[PDB]
Amino acid sequence: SLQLWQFLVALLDDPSNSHFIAWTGRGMEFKLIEPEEVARRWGIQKNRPAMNYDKLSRSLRYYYEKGIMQKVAGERYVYKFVCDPEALFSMAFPDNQRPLL
């Protein structure tokens, strides 16, 4: 399984992608430098050729409403991953949140 937050982290980990998505250097903050290019790549990844940023952005909002990300104030395309105990559990268990016997 691959969901959007993981996909973004995969792109962010490779600094050769910095011209369209980058860790800003402020903690866990990242910027979508070319939002439609990020969306295009997500569409390729998921075989959804009609993917676009409008669609992708819904997931960003779902993540910040759930406290997995935060939207940075004053910015359009700057977000941060949340580093807290509860968010770490959600990120550790994307597919099963009753993982123990």
Curated annotation (Swiss-Prot):
Localization per Swiss-Prot or TrEMBL: Nucleus
Domain of life (superkingdom): Eukaryota
PTM text: Sumoylated.
Known tissue expression: Very highly expressed in brain, highly expressed in testis, lung and heart, moderately in spleen, small intestine, pancreas and colon, weakly in liver, prostate and thymus, very weakly in skeletal muscle, kidney and ovary and not in placenta and peripheral blood leukocytes.
DNA-binding region boundaries: 2-82
Family indicated by similarity: Belongs to the ETS family.
Function: Transcriptional activator that binds to DNA sequences containing the consensus pentanucleotide 5'-CGGA[AT]-3'. Required for olfactory dopaminergic neuron differentiation; may directly activate expression of tyrosine hydroxylase (TH).
Disease in which the protein is involved: Ewing sarcoma: A highly malignant, metastatic, primitive small round cell tumor of bone and soft tissue that affects children and adolescents. It belongs to the Ewing sarcoma family of tumors, a group of morphologically heterogeneous neoplasms that share the same cytogenetic features. They are considered neural tumors derived from cells of the neural crest. Ewing sarcoma represents the less differentiated form of the tumors.
UniProt-recorded name of the protein: ETS translocation variant 1
Native source organism of the sequence: Homo sapiens
Range of the intact protein held here: 334 to 434 of 477
